[PDB]
Scaffold this active site. Structure first.
Site, PDB file in Angstrom:
ATOM      1  N   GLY A 230       0.801  -1.213   0.000  1.00 56.56           N
ATOM      2  CA  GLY A 230       0.000   0.000   0.000  1.00 56.56           C
ATOM      3  C   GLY A 230       0.840   1.271   0.000  1.00 56.56           C
ATOM      4  O   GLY A 230       0.357   2.337  -0.395  1.00 56.56           O
ATOM      5  N   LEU A 318      -2.234  -6.016   5.658  1.00 54.94           N
ATOM      6  CA  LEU A 318      -2.071  -6.566   6.996  1.00 54.94           C
ATOM      7  C   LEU A 318      -0.586  -6.636   7.322  1.00 54.94           C
ATOM      8  O   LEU A 318      -0.131  -6.099   8.333  1.00 54.94           O
ATOM      9  CB  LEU A 318      -2.649  -7.980   7.064  1.00 54.94           C
ATOM     10  CG  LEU A 318      -4.067  -8.158   7.590  1.00 54.94           C
ATOM     11  CD1 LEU A 318      -4.450  -9.630   7.522  1.00 54.94           C
ATOM     12  CD2 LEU A 318      -4.137  -7.655   9.025  1.00 54.94           C
ATOM     13  N   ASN A 321       1.184  -3.345   8.277  1.00 55.10           N
ATOM     14  CA  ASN A 321       1.017  -2.830   9.630  1.00 55.10           C
ATOM     15  C   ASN A 321       1.769  -3.665  10.664  1.00 55.10           C
ATOM     16  O   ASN A 321       2.386  -3.123  11.580  1.00 55.10           O
ATOM     17  CB  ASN A 321      -0.461  -2.777  10.009  1.00 55.10           C
ATOM     18  CG  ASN A 321      -0.702  -1.982  11.280  1.00 55.10           C
ATOM     19  OD1 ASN A 321      -0.708  -0.750  11.266  1.00 55.10           O
ATOM     20  ND2 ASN A 321      -0.877  -2.681  12.390  1.00 55.10           N
ATOM     21  N   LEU A 374       6.302 -12.232   5.649  1.00 54.27           N
ATOM     22  CA  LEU A 374       5.084 -12.710   6.302  1.00 54.27           C
ATOM     23  C   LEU A 374       4.127 -13.152   5.204  1.00 54.27           C
ATOM     24  O   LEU A 374       3.686 -12.340   4.390  1.00 54.27           O
ATOM     25  CB  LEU A 374       4.451 -11.593   7.132  1.00 54.27           C
ATOM     26  CG  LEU A 374       3.174 -11.946   7.902  1.00 54.27           C
ATOM     27  CD1 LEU A 374       3.466 -13.036   8.922  1.00 54.27           C
ATOM     28  CD2 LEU A 374       2.638 -10.696   8.594  1.00 54.27           C
ATOM     29  N   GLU A 764      -3.439  37.021   4.542  1.00 53.09           N
ATOM     30  CA  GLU A 764      -3.604  38.473   4.562  1.00 53.09           C
ATOM     31  C   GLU A 764      -2.245  39.146   4.388  1.00 53.09           C
ATOM     32  O   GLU A 764      -2.141  40.191   3.752  1.00 53.09           O
ATOM     33  CB  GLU A 764      -4.236  38.941   5.876  1.00 53.09           C
ATOM     34  CG  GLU A 764      -4.428  40.449   5.926  1.00 53.09           C
ATOM     35  CD  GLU A 764      -5.199  40.918   7.144  1.00 53.09           C
ATOM     36  OE1 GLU A 764      -5.542  42.118   7.203  1.00 53.09           O
ATOM     37  OE2 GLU A 764      -5.460  40.096   8.040  1.00 53.09           O
ATOM     38  N   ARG A 842      -8.197  44.545  18.640  1.00 52.07           N
ATOM     39  CA  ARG A 842      -9.500  43.905  18.477  1.00 52.07           C
ATOM     40  C   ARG A 842      -9.816  43.075  19.719  1.00 52.07           C
ATOM     41  O   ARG A 842     -10.968  43.004  20.148  1.00 52.07           O
ATOM     42  CB  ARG A 842      -9.534  43.020  17.220  1.00 52.07           C
ATOM     43  CG  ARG A 842     -10.867  42.303  16.997  1.00 52.07           C
ATOM     44  CD  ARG A 842     -11.011  41.767  15.564  1.00 52.07           C
ATOM     45  NE  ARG A 842     -11.201  42.839  14.584  1.00 52.07           N
ATOM     46  CZ  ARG A 842     -12.355  43.470  14.369  1.00 52.07           C
ATOM     47  NH1 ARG A 842     -13.436  43.136  15.060  1.00 52.07           N
ATOM     48  NH2 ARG A 842     -12.427  44.447  13.472  1.00 52.07           N
ATOM     49  N   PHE A 876      -9.411  37.554  14.316  1.00 51.95           N
ATOM     50  CA  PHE A 876      -8.408  38.598  14.516  1.00 51.95           C
ATOM     51  C   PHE A 876      -8.301  39.082  15.965  1.00 51.95           C
ATOM     52  O   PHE A 876      -8.389  40.285  16.230  1.00 51.95           O
ATOM     53  CB  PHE A 876      -8.765  39.775  13.606  1.00 51.95           C
ATOM     54  CG  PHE A 876      -7.604  40.649  13.229  1.00 51.95           C
ATOM     55  CD1 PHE A 876      -6.687  40.233  12.265  1.00 51.95           C
ATOM     56  CD2 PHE A 876      -7.473  41.927  13.772  1.00 51.95           C
ATOM     57  CE1 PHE A 876      -5.661  41.081  11.835  1.00 51.95           C
ATOM     58  CE2 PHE A 876      -6.451  42.786  13.353  1.00 51.95           C
ATOM     59  CZ  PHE A 876      -5.544  42.364  12.380  1.00 51.95           C
ATOM     60  N   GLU A1223     -16.481  36.513  10.150  1.00 49.40           N
ATOM     61  CA  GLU A1223     -15.883  36.160  11.439  1.00 49.40           C
ATOM     62  C   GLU A1223     -16.774  36.056  12.678  1.00 49.40           C
ATOM     63  O   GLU A1223     -16.521  35.230  13.557  1.00 49.40           O
ATOM     64  CB  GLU A1223     -14.778  37.157  11.762  1.00 49.40           C
ATOM     65  CG  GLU A1223     -13.696  37.261  10.719  1.00 49.40           C
ATOM     66  CD  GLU A1223     -12.920  38.545  10.866  1.00 49.40           C
ATOM     67  OE1 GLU A1223     -13.471  39.618  10.521  1.00 49.40           O
ATOM     68  OE2 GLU A1223     -11.769  38.484  11.342  1.00 49.40           O
TER      69      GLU A1223
END
Ligand code: FAD
Ligand code: MTE
Ligand code: 141
Ligand code: FES
Ligand code: FES
Ligand code: MOW
Ligand code: CA
EC number: 1.17.1.4
Lengths: 1286, 99, 50, 50
Positions: A230, A318, A321, A374, A764, A842, A876, A1223
């Site tokens: 995988g 299997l 893991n 395995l 921003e 703020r 903010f 917001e």
């Protein structure tokens, strides 16, 4: 090398030179030009790269379909596999597939970056089950993340597959007969005998073994060869662990490794079987076999419920893991406790051994020989008198790494309660899966009773000890979980042996999903309003269909020029140090290397940042881990990455200041104290009956916009001209920062922003860090250059929400009335000022929330530290201050012994009151939102029901809390409250609107199109908004402060008026004519059809010096009531129900506004209960990916989710009576935090003490660790000075 | 621009109208999303007509800057522009002409 | 005419709403825009000519 | 115009023009053009969407 042959969307692909290291994602995006599939994390935890895979299963003689993360799928594992991407199921150019149509119309798409991945997870489900149940629908997204929507709309829209915002009756039905067929050519190939394949890459050799015999020979010849199935582990090691495995052997095709056999002792699975296959087989077995034989199977299934998601479980094997042998494997503890049998082989040998404590001798090692592999695993049936349990607790229920995970088994003598065998195996308590043998051995032959419970717990406490410096931290929590899990096992076994106390029963129940219930209430538009007037209607986001189809173009989706190069940032690994030297001799050896750039290459200025206190590239000193030192430019992203990684920097450490505490102790701040004081505190505290003092902390937050920062810079070679495509909310600052660095006039730089896959304030300003570096590279090389940050780079470098530390003191009367309050705030600002000051302002502006406090004093201090500079994050600063406020308000209620809602109400402002910063509250709707929410949520009736539940439950508790909020609307910086627009009407009558705002998923362009359509009185179909650019609207403020609709709406409105005035003469001379007729007449009469529009928010300008002036234009209000249920034994919890009443005035678009409310609410929920960033003491961020940073998941939202927009509340202060919504709703997520705290109190009253007025501290985020540790009991207590003064 | 020096002349005009050096003015290209419904560049009247349009737009700029110039007569063009921006006065405008 | 540079056009298809951005050697961006829109059958506001 | 860099996926177009001053088009055969390496497609009137 053999040719790699597979199919993509029905088209055959022949890759003659497949490189083993190439992922399907890279191949799709860079080689096939299919950019619909996105990169969101590269570690399998976001699902943005989800695609469907189809293949002919030889062992099942059937065509199977399953999902998979394209970011972890090596194309070399796809020979003869058919891939289906978002582009393969539909598009707006042809026809949308039902899945795409519904997620789009149901408003399940905002920024749109996660949509393709979610669309494919849903699609895959439907290809497996045309009519899934609600359960299956939710489980389909265990591996998909969305930051914008709040998930509700996505689930509700898809639920249709099992006034109103959308109408299901309009949905095209699903018709399986019309689905694309399995490629005929592939179906023919099934008749060709499988053959071993060899692929050769730049650094790796890949061998696809066709037979077990070939595999064993290969392993005998190349014992070091790394097996891959995988790739969900190897991929991680290769990408993030700096690992390189020269030779890989993929045994996925081998029949023996995929065989499933039902034996008398149990069910055997070939080591290559996918976990999803094991899950399917065990479920069927549990449904057919007696309960007494499936004890172990059910343990495995319980873990599998919380094992990654569908994409990972469908490819994860299997063997993978088991052999990876990770300390936190959720399966190995179960396999060890159950003695699951492992059949191991090598050329010439074969042995079968039950897994036991010796199988994992040391870290990441197993007892397999170098030549062995395995082959298969046999999960045992459980016997009579044999019981099993499996538990897992993490930071979030879905797709998370275990904090502590276990497998527990007990075998009693026939028909007795006398222990014959006992196995308690844990993951997450050592550098390997361990068994508490010392403890369990002492119980052999003992009976299952209270004494055994006590002995085992004491044993566990001593045997599973954790040194204070244990990796992962959370020492107390983990040890407590080890005992709590056993307690759960203990009670569960008593139950199975059967009498159990009723109040203890729930402790034995496994997580149970409750059916969802969602309701959205909003107001219908006026009776006579024109159908073409869409203002006030739930019009879907205009780009939603293209976002569901993967046609929506994001920065990196833009095609690269043939000569375009790639840039990788070189950052500091030290928090504070001098740069002694930089050696690139090694980087220069990586193929495709072009150059290393640093401070000295800058032609203009190396001084940047909002306050000119930052460097573009570090000079002499680095002031934080992640501090940009330079950058590598190469021909491919891989080469740039690899070269940058070998750039060697020699440092000399300097004293560092990391924490707020360190900063305070060292007097390390930016600027002087900020403060707002009103009334007479001394007098206030003198009249108060009670006074409470305390300290509170709220952790930061990573924006986790699904699309990371990205910039493409095109140097023209003329007059210093440069054109950039950037994922930013601030084209203006991007433009000036680039110009400053280059040393050229601003008029030479063009910045264009199409859309952002999320911004949340994180774009921003901090987007310039990447933009400026890329611009320099383009300038120096003369070639176009681009850079998109990987998730780990983004989380480390770009900054996040400001962590806050508060010290408060509140005075109040026995009635709960507040008379005095002092709060000193401290924020960890990082290595630069950036927006930290305005954010604190703020914060101070909201330390009152919705309460009138006659005497109040609030201060703020910015801590200067050696951490990346923190910045704007939805709210903010408001959320932090509002949180601190509600905290002491909750303590006042408890201290007074009065109902919290009564105390909050009596302290609430009244229409016309002045805030602590002296602004009059006009049109204060909190009272209405409050009463309506109390009523629609049935608060009181449910309050008694909560108390009942708590009396009938000892190890589970519920909490209920209703909180309000008010948020000031307008940038704290006065001059930023300005907006311009540009509108052109072409001669065919079509209109092109342009404004200063950008689209980041909030639906701004949609709203602007709605506004223009109404103002001009023409259908929205004749209006279009393509992008945002500095050469159409200059000097724009960043798209922020939730005022974009307000201000750009006016600018667009004003521009439309001018157009109407110019067309008026022609409309009059031909009243019966069309819009097209008037436009053409104006043109031929030489009347300009182009104009600008502008808006300036009036009367703004507050001063912290005089505590006077208007800081905001108006306030947005709302109220939220939330109920939760906590597991007092694990820390996990459920968000049962949430009811929100929000006042957004007369909504311009209730669909988008409810989406903003739900989305902001979920981000707050994340900030206060799930999201946490961990840093080493030296200042190095530990959590740099979705695997460790847990944002809300589909399963994280309130099961019953109700949202209502306050009706009949027009706001005369904004465009068409609407109100900002971006917001304001976020803080409402705190209602979940305080409901949790309510629940914790119940638990403490149950087991901790009897002080009904005790005030225990609970910082944010209230994570499972904090919740569990707060539920003090006999277990937490189990996990001595010579003298003590009397 | 097809070699006749139209942009040069427009920069020359804008510089005279705004009374600032040409070095502070730039013309990058012609695009349908900045100036729509444009007549083809022809009839030898481009200088005549675009010159007037540029001229008008410049006049609109000067008027918006006037209050700031008056308040700070000895200031620089940069000072007035920044003052205008901070006072939230739009620094973008269109210009138009009809023979 | 014998302009030293002959006729030339680069056309960039966005894949969104019929949008197309073109770089053209022409004295008439307007007619280029409308003629391309007419041929494609999309509104003129979807076409950008530079 | 042509000095502008080409995208990595940028293709090239060559016009197919009439060799007759006035005539009916009886048929068009591209079977030979399709053999040229790098050939992508031949476009004609019917391909126009608008
Ligand atoms: C987003 C995400 C979430 C995850 N969630 C969880 C979780 O909740 N719990 C948990 O325990 N794990 C989790 N995992 C880990 C991982 O998915 C498992 O360990 C997986 O089962 C490994 O399987 P694989 O086939 O992908 O391994 P690969 O990466 O293909 O191989 C892993 C290792 O196994 C060896 N190997 C494979 N097959 C054999 C064999 N037959 N014989 C000998 N050696 C072999 C390989 O050489 C290699 O060293 C997660 C991973 C991601 C990326
Ligand atoms: N889907 C989505 N919604 C979002 C954001 C975002 O990045 N994506 N940004 C938030 C923030 S921080 C702000 S300030 C406002 C900005 O946009 P507005 O002014 O148009 O409301 O939207 C909020 N809602
Ligand atoms: O007052 C502000 N509020 C903001 N929200 N997001 C960005 C903001 C800003 O710059 N200023
Ligand atoms: S990019 Fe693949 S899971 Fe996030
Ligand atoms: S719409 Fe899902 S992350 Fe933006
Ligand atoms: O950009 Mo809003 S915090
Ligand atoms: Ca900062």
């Amino acid at each position: 090398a053999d040719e790699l042959v597979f199919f993509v969307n029905g088209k055959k692909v022949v890759e003659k030179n497949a490189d083993p290291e190439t992922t399907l994602l890279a191949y799709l995006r860079r080689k096939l030009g299919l950019r619909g599939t996105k990169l969101g994390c590269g570690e399998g935890g976001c699902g943005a790269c989800t695609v469907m895979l189809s293949k002919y299963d030889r062992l099942q003689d059937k065509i199977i379909h399953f999902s998979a993360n394209a970011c972890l799928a090596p194309i070399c594992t796809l020979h003869h596999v058919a891939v289906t991407t978002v582009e393969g199921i539909g598009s707006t150019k042809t026809r949308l597939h039902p899945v795409q149509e519904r997620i789009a119309k149901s408003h399940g798409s905002q920024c749109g970056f996660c949509t393709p991945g979610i669309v494919m997870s849903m699609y895959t489900l439907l290809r497996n089950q045309p009519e899934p149940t609600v359960e299956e629908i939710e489980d389909a997204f265990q591996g998909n993340l969305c930051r914008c929507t709040g998930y509700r709309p996505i689930l509700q829209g898809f639920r249709t597959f099992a006034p109103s915002l959308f109408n299901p009756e309009e949905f095209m039905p699903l018709d399986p007969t019309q689905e694309p067929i399995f490629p005929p050519e592939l179906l023919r190939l099934k008749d060709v005998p499988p053959k071993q394949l060899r692929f050769e890459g730049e650094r790796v050799t890949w061998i696809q073994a066709s037979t077990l015999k070939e595999l064993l020979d290969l392993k005998a010849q190349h014992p070091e060869a790394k097996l891959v199935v995988g790739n969900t582990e190897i991929g991680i090691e290769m990408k993030f662990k700096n690992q390189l495995f020269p030779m890989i052997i993929c045994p996925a095709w081998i029949p023996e490794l995929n065989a499933v056999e039902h034996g008398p002792e149990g069910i055997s699975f070939g080591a290559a079987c996918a976990l999803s296959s094991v899950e399917k087989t065990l479920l069927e077995a549990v449904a057919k076999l007696p309960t007494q034989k499936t004890e172990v199977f059910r343990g495995v299934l319980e873990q599998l419920r919380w094992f990654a998601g569908k994409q990972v479980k469908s490819v994860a094997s299997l063997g993978g893991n088991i052999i990876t042998a990770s300390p936190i494997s959720d399966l190995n503890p179960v396999f060890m406790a159950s003695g699951t049998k492992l059949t191991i082989v090598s050329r010439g040998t074969r042995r079968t051994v039950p897994m036991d404590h010796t199988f994992f001798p040391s870290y990441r090692k197993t007892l397999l020989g170098p030549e062995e592999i395995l082959l298969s695993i046999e999960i045992p049936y459980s016997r009579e008198d044999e019981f099993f349990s499996a538990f897992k607790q993490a930071s979030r229920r879905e797709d998370d790494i275990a904090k502590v995970t276990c497998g527990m088994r007990v075998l009693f003598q026939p028909g007795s309660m006398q222990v014959k065998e006992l196995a308690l195996c844990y993951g997450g308590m050592a550098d390997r899966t361990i068994s508490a043998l010392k403890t369990t051995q002492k119980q052999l032959s003992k009976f299952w009773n209270e004494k055994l419970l006590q002995d085992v717990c004491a044993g566990l406490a001593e045997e599973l000890s954790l040194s204070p410096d244990a990796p992962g931290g959370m020492i107390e929590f983990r040890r407590t979980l080890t005992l709590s899990f056993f307690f759960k096992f203990y009670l569960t076994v008593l139950k199975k042996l059967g009498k159990l106390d009723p109040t203890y029963t729930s402790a034995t129940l496994l997580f149970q999903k409750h059916p969802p219930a969602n309701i959205q209430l909003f107001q219908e538009v006026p009776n006579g309003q024109s159908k073409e007037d869409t203002v006030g209607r739930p019009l879907p986001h205009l780009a939603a269909a293209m976002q569901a189809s993967g046609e929506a173009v994001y920065c990196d989706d833009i095609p690269r020029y043939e000569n375009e190069l790639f840039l990788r940032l070189v950052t500091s690994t030290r928090a504070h140090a001098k740069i002694k030297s930089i050696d690139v001799s090694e980087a220069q050896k990586v193929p495709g290397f072009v150059c290393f750039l640093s401070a000295d290459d800058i032609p203009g200025s190396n001084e940047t940042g909002l306050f000119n206190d930052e460097t573009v590239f570090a000079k002499d000193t680095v002031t934080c881990v992640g501090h940009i030192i330079g950058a590598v430019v190469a021909d491919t992203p891989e080469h740039a990455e690899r070269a940058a990684h070998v750039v060697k920097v020699t440092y000399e450490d300097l004293p560092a200041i990391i924490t707020i505490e360190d900063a305070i102790k060292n007097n390390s701040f930016y600027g002087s104290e900020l403060k707002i004081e009103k009334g007479d505190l001394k007098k206030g505290f003198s009249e108060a009956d009670n006074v409470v003092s305390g300290e509170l902390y709220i952790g930061g937050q990573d924006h986790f916009y699904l699309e990371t920062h990205c910039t493409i810079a095109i140097p023209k070679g003329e007059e210093g001209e440069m054109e950039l495509f950037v994922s930013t909310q601030n084209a203006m600052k991007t433009q000036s920062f680039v110009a400053k660095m280059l040393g050229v006039p601003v008029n030479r730089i063009l910045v264009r922003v199409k859309r952002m896959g999320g911004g949340f304030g994180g774009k921003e300003t901090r987007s310039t860090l990447v933009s400026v570096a890329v611009a320099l590279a383009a300038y120096k090389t003369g070639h176009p250059v681009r850079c998109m940050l990987d998730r780990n780079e983004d989380m480390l470098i770009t900054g996040g929400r400001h962590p806050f530390l508060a010290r408060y003191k509140v005075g109040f009367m026995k009635t709960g009335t507040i008379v005095a309050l002092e709060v000193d705030h401290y924020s960890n600002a990082g290595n630069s000022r950036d927006l930290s000051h305005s954010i604190m302002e703020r914060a101070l502006f909201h330390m009152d929330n919705c309460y009138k406090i006659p005497n109040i004093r609030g201060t703020g201090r910015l801590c200067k530290t050696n951490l990346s500079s923190n910045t704007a994050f939805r709210g903010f600063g408001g959320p932090q201050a509002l949180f601190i406020a509600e905290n002491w308000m909750s303590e006042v209620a408890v201290t007074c012994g009065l109902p919290a809602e009564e105390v909050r109400w009596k302290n609430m402002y009244k229409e016309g009151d002045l805030t602590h910063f002296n602004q009059r509250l006009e049109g204060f709707s909190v009272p209405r939102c409050w009463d309506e929410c109390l009523k629609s949520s049935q608060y009181y009736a449910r309050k008694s029901e909560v108390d009942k539940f708590n009396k009938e439950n000892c190890w589970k508790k519920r909490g209920l809390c209703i909180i309000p909020t008010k948020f000031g609307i307008s940038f704290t910086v006065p001059f930023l409250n300005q907006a311009g627009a540009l509108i052109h009407v072409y001669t065919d009558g079509s209109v092109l609107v342009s404004h200063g705002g950008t689209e980041m998923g909030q639906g701004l362009h949609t709203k602007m199109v709605q506004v223009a359509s109404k103002a001009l009185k023409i259908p929205i179909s004749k209006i279009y908004i393509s992008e945002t650019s500095t050469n159409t609207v200059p000097n724009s403020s960043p798209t922020a402060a939730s005022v974009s609709t307000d201000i750009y709406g006016q600018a667009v409105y004003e521009a439309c008026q001018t157009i109407l005035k110019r067309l008026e003469p022609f409309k009059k001379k031909n009243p019966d004519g069309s819009w097209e007729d008037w436009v053409m007449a104006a043109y031929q009469d030489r009347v300009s059809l182009s104009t600008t529009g502008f808006y300036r928010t009036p009367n703004l300008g507050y001063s912290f010096e005089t505590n006077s002036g208007n800081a905001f234009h108006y306030f947005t209000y709302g109220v939220a009531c939330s109920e939760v249920e906590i597991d007092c034994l694990t820390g996990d919890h459920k968000n049962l129900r949430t009811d929100i009443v929000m006042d957004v005035g007369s909504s311009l678009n209730p669909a988008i506004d409810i989406g903003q409310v739900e989305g902001a609410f979920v981000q707050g929920l994340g900030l206060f209960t799930l999201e946490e960033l961990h840093y080493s003491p030296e200042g190095s961020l530990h959590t740099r990916g979705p695997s460790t940073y847990k944002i809300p998941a589909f399963g994280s939202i309130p099961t019953e989710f109700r949202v209502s927009l306050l009706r009949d509340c027009p706001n005369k202060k904004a465009i068409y009576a609407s109100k900002a919504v971006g917001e304001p709703p976020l803080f409402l997520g705190a209602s979940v935090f305080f409901a949790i705290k309510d629940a914790i109190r119940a638990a403490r009253a149950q087991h901790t003490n009897n002080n009904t007025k005790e005030l225990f501290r609970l910082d944010s985020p209230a994570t499972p660790e904090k919740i569990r540790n707060a539920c003090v009991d006999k277990f937490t207590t189990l996990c001595k000075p010579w003298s003590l003064r009397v």
